[PDB]
Design a binder for this molecule. Sequence first.
Ligand code: SAH
Ligand code: CO
Ligand code: CO
Ligand code: CO
Ligand code: CO
Ligand code: CO
Ligand code: CO
Ligand code: CO
Lengths: 8, 246
Amino acid sequence: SKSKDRKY
Amino acid sequence: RHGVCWIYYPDGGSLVGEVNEDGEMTGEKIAYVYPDERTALYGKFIDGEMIEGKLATLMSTEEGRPHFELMPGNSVYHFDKSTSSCISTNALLPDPYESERVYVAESLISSAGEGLFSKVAVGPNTVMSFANGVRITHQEVDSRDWALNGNTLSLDEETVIDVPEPYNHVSKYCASLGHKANHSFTPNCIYDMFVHPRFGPIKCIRTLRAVEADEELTVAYGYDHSPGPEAPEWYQVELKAFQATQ
Ligand SMILES: Nc1ncnc2c1ncn2[C@@H]1O[C@H](CSCC[C@H](N)C(=O)O)[C@@H](O)[C@H]1O
Ligand SMILES: [Co+2]
Ligand SMILES: [Co+2]
Ligand SMILES: [Co+2]
Ligand SMILES: [Co+2]
Ligand SMILES: [Co+2]
Ligand SMILES: [Co+2]
Ligand SMILES: [Co+2]
């Protein structure tokens, strides 16, 4: 994802 | 029954007051107390939603009841959750807790623009700043170029918070300042969930360790490293270098 801090 | 209720969020902020007959945080003397257990927004709430909170200091508690002193000025705040297109009804009105703890200045990191700095020395686990922005979808964010995704922060699986240009300028938006933290693979802060009385459900920046006054606050941006990495080039470069020192 092109965003900070996503839980993968 | 003529007693006082405190409801703490996991982040350490709380609502406090005499609840109504239905057990709701509703009244003219309800307060939200920030995680310092000292800074408060005191006034009219309906079922825990801030209608008009005035800035106050929690001076003492007696028998569990908080005793507040209102701060000077006529600083009032209200619940004002962002939408997909509106960041804030008071974009230039700073959060009073944040404004005592952080400031924005040129980053110490080379070529990284502005950064977020501590105003004072604080201990570990201290909430320093709030990450608020417009609320858009992962689909919108992932479908567009990195050039538009510099300020995006995932909130949960449904929502991304963004601070779209030109609200990335402090002269245009300074209600919250968390979007100003730069990246480090050896950060002194982390993102955590936060329930804010003005901003609603957002994220905050919390220290991992003690920090000195005038220290730059950094967070790990946490881009996916093996979807090479899906990340801007400055980050991909920094990642290689970091991996080297390891
Ligand atoms: N470690 C790092 N190295 C280089 N640039 C960085 C960085 N961390 C953050 N940035 C910059 O900061 C942006 C994210 S927003 C962070 C605040 C920004 N520096 C500002 O002045 O508003 C990135 O797009 C990148 O331009
Ligand atoms: Co403190
Ligand atoms: Co006391
Ligand atoms: Co691209
Ligand atoms: Co600009
Ligand atoms: Co400016
Ligand atoms: Co420490
Ligand atoms: Co780049």
